[PDB]
Amino acid sequence: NLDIIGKRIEKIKQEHETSWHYDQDHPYKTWAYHGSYETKQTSSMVNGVVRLLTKPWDIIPMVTQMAMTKEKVDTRTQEPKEGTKKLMKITAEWLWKELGKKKTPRMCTREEFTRKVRSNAALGAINKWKSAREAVEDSGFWELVDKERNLHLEGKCETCVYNMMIWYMWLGARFLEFEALGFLNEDHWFSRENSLSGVEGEGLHKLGYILRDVSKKEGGAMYADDTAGWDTRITLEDLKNEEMVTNHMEGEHKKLAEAIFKLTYQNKVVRVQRPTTVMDIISRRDQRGSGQVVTYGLNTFTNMEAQLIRQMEGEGVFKSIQHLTVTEEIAVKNWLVRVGRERLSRMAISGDDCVVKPLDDRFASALTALNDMGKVRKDIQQWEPSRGWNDWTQVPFCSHHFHELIMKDGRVLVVPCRNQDELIGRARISQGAGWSLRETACLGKSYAQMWSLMYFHRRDLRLAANAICSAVPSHWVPTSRATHEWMTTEDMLTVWNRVWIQENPWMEDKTPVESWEEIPYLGKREDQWCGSLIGLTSRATWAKNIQTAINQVRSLIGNEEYTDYMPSMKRFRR
């Protein structure tokens, strides 16, 4: 408790000795409260380039409401039963060994961390310096890092404090997490090749093919149960099974990694603002509070473990979670060794999201271990059987569904899709402020190129993508603040051919496509089912008069070099 967190707490008390107070009206039952101190301080902006080129959507509330802008955290999960705890440790032990068979844990470097900040990436960071890039150049910072680092080697912590607002941390604390645990993401531990269930680094153009491959296995329905607030349901037992990755480590790395797990994950200190504005300093040992990238990999690991145990329950490998016999342990260990890898291949798991094609439908009612691990399903009664999907083209995964689309030459594309209002509503939103017109244009171009690559099969998005790329200067580089092949100035037809034909392991015939007109759409009715405005007067006027909207945006940006991409479509090709 205060042993491990005291130093961090006692250091904060002293920076604010002129405001410390043990408020007794603090609204915390499940978090331990420590004190408060004086504080005072703190939305989504519209992308004008995308909005001017999507005029019909100005009157669609599902689009326009998206731009307008927590009991879960204050909850406590019960400790699982002894049989549940045994299933989790055995499975976790086996799963780290499988993930480790072809990978070597290793420390990530200042050099690697330095390049990541320059390329700009969401590091959930939070004042001698201003931006992240400037701090990385100043050897003073690194001296601060050294102090905390040597402290971690002693089994102690001083500065590793979370700032709830998503848990942000100072850049140095993020470095120390990336040093110890960055290998999981940097070296693709959760790749499909290495983990069999995982999809890290696969791409939205590969997810559909991956789900279609799972569908080809003999078994029951496909199950895609979402968990209610996954991060809040992570138990100290989960955090201890995750820590077992340190058993594959050595030397310094092992001690630095053990300290991240012990000092910042299994014991946490958080500063949370309260309007009543008095920064509350609370602590708790459970729940998910890591960097967003380490959170992804440990979420994937623990979800893979949970789903293998639900498959064991459905197969009758064990009968009760209250206690595991010596013979039930023999059977679980022998199931893992005998069919473990085949059962991981029956799943697609991305952090807290999963699709499972179990051996049969007994899985649907195998709920005792899943509920007892605290991974309670979203929007279904705790003891009601799961509703499975009979058609892989209906299964939800990573906020998408997937269509089978046949090209005029018989080759088969499996394409990602979601409700088109969600796609247009997200492209009309820009994060943060101080954006120039040029920067706003380059962000609209990034959305346009993603649409050309991923959602070319949606009539409205191919037309809007062509319009935005015609409206933005041809040489301006897409920016942004899932493999991102759209972040390039290369011609989008050449990128389309590389992604969908050349590099696509499910396409045997490598014949390049010569024009956009060879690249097919969904059926007209399927396009409308997934939110197309085709057949509306508003949409027909927009399409017919698109050159006028393109010319409005060109006039705003000014006298620049533009390309007309509209004749790449049949209806504008004279």
Ligand X SMILES: COc1ccc(C(=O)C2CCNCC2)cc1
Return residues touching Cl ion (CB under 5 A): 389-391, 394
Choose between 206 and 539: whose C-beta lies nearer to ligand X.
Answer: 539
Choose between 347 and 417: whose C-beta lies nearer to Zn ion.
Answer: 417
Q: Is 31 annotated as a binding residue?
A: no
Residue 275, SS3 per DSSP: coil
Q: Is 226 annotated as a binding residue?
A: yes
Choose between 370 and 522: whose C-beta lies nearer to ligand X.
Answer: 522
- Contact 47/37 with Cβ under 8 angstroms? no
Q: Is 398 annotated as a binding residue?
A: no
534 binds ligand X (CB under 6 A): yes
Q: Which residue is nearest to ligand X (CB)?
A: 535
- Contact 348/199 with Cβ under 8 angstroms? yes
Choose between 512 and 523: whose C-beta lies nearer to ligand X.
Answer: 523
**Binding partner of residue 160 among Zn ion, ligand X, Cl ion, none, CB under 5 to 8 Å per kind?**
Zn ion
Cα 136 versus chain centre, distance:
26
* # binding residues, ligand X (CB under 6 A): 4
67 binds ligand X (CB under 6 A): no
157 binds Zn ion (CB under 5 A): yes
Please choose, from the candidates 20, 42, 35, 291, the residue with its C-alpha nearest in 3D space to the C-alpha of residue 162.
Answer: 291
- How far is it, in rounded angstroms, from Cα 458 to Cα 469? 17
Choose between 257 and 530: whose C-beta lies nearer to Zn ion.
Answer: 530
462 binds ligand X (CB under 6 A): no
**Binding partner of residue 459 among Cl ion, ligand X, Zn ion, none, CB under 5 to 8 Å per kind?**
ligand X
Q: Is 352 annotated as a binding residue?
A: yes
524 binds ligand X (CB under 6 A): yes
Span between the terminal Cα atoms of the chain, in Å: 74
535 binds ligand X (CB under 6 A): yes
Partners of residue 317 on adjacent β-strands: none
**Binding partner of residue 394 among ligand X, Cl ion, Zn ion, none, CB under 5 to 8 Å per kind?**
Cl ion
- How far is it, in rounded angstroms, from Cα 178 to Cα 267? 18
457 binds ligand X (CB under 6 A): no
459 binds ligand X (CB under 6 A): yes
Q: Is 160 annotated as a binding residue?
A: yes
164 binds ligand X (CB under 6 A): no
- How far is it, in rounded angstroms, from Cα 384 to Cα 371? 12
- Helix residue spans in 224-382 (DSSP H): 236-243, 251-259, 292-315, 326-344, 368-372
- CB neighbour class for 426 (10 Å; exposed up to 12, middle 13-18, buried from 19): middle
Q: Is 354 annotated as a binding residue?
A: no
530 binds Zn ion (CB under 5 A): yes
Taking the complex as a whole, the smallest distance from the CB of residue 391 to Cl ion amounts, in Å, to 4
569 binds ligand X (CB under 6 A): no
- Exposure class string for 474-510: b at 16+ Cβ within 10 A, else e: eebebbeebeebbeeeeebbebbbebbbeebeebeee
- How far is it, in rounded angstroms, from Cα 215 to Cα 217? 6
Q: Is 152 annotated as a binding residue?
A: yes
Query: And the tokens for 439?
Result: 């920067």
Task: Give, in degrees to the nearest 5, the angle at Cα 402 between 399 and 408.
Answer: 145
**Binding partner of residue 545 among Cl ion, ligand X, Zn ion, none, CB under 5 to 8 Å per kind?**
none
**Binding partner of residue 427 among Cl ion, ligand X, Zn ion, none, CB under 5 to 8 Å per kind?**
none
Contacts within 8 Å (CB) and 24+ apart, 230-233: 230/288, 230/299, 230/303, 230/351, 230/352, 230/375, 231/287, 231/288, 231/289, 231/295, 231/299, 231/352, 232/72, 232/73, 232/75, 232/77, 232/287, 232/288, 233/77, 233/374, 233/375, 233/376
Query: And the tokens for 522?
Result: 């969904």
Strand-strand pairing, 278-284 and 268-272:
antiparallel
- Exposure class string for 313-327: b at 16+ Cβ within 10 A, else e: bbbebbeebeebeee
Q: Token pair 């590969």 is at which residue?
A: 206
* H helix or E strand, kind and range, residue 140: helix 139-153
- How far is it, in rounded angstroms, from Cα 20 to Cα 493? 61
Choose between 221 and 546: whose C-beta lies nearer to ligand X.
Answer: 546
Choose between 294 and 395: whose C-beta lies nearer to Cl ion.
Answer: 395
211 binds Zn ion (CB under 5 A): no
Residue 256, SS3 per DSSP: helix
Taking the complex as a whole, the smallest distance from the CB of residue 121 to Zn ion amounts, in Å, to 22
Taking the complex as a whole, the smallest distance from the CB of residue 57 to ligand X amounts, in Å, to 16
Taking the complex as a whole, the smallest distance from the CB of residue 458 to ligand X amounts, in Å, to 11
Only segment of 127-135, 158-166, 340-348, 363-371 that touches Zn ion (CB under 5 A) = 158-166
**Binding partner of residue 391 among Zn ion, ligand X, Cl ion, none, CB under 5 to 8 Å per kind?**
Cl ion
Q: Which residues contact 235 (CB under 8 A, 6 or more apart)?
A: 77, 79, 80, 286, 373, 374
Interaction pattern, residues 406-425, with Zn ion; x per rule: CB under 5 A: -----------x--------
Choose between 21 and 147: whose C-beta lies nearer to Zn ion.
Answer: 147
- How far is it, in rounded angstroms, from Cα 17 to Cα 65? 45
Q: Is 253 annotated as a binding residue?
A: no
- Contact 81/321 with Cβ under 8 angstroms? yes
Single-letter code of the amino acid located at 42: T
Choose between 231 and 518: whose C-beta lies nearer to ligand X.
Answer: 518
445 binds ligand X (CB under 6 A): no
298 binds Zn ion (CB under 5 A): no
Choose between 27 and 523: whose C-beta lies nearer to ligand X.
Answer: 523
Given 4, 160, 181, 405, the residue binding Zn ion (CB under 5 A):
160
- Where along the sequence are the contacts to Zn ion (CB under 5 A)? 148, 157, 160, 417, 530
Residue list for the binding site: 148, 152, 157, 160, 226-227, 229-231, 299, 352-353, 378, 401, 403, 417, 530
Residue list for the binding site for CTP: 229-231, 299, 378
Residue list for the binding site for Zn(2+): 148, 152, 157, 160, 401, 403, 417, 530
- Where along the sequence are the contacts to ligand X (CB under 6 A)? 459, 524, 534-535
Residue list for the binding site for Mg(2+): 226-227, 352-353
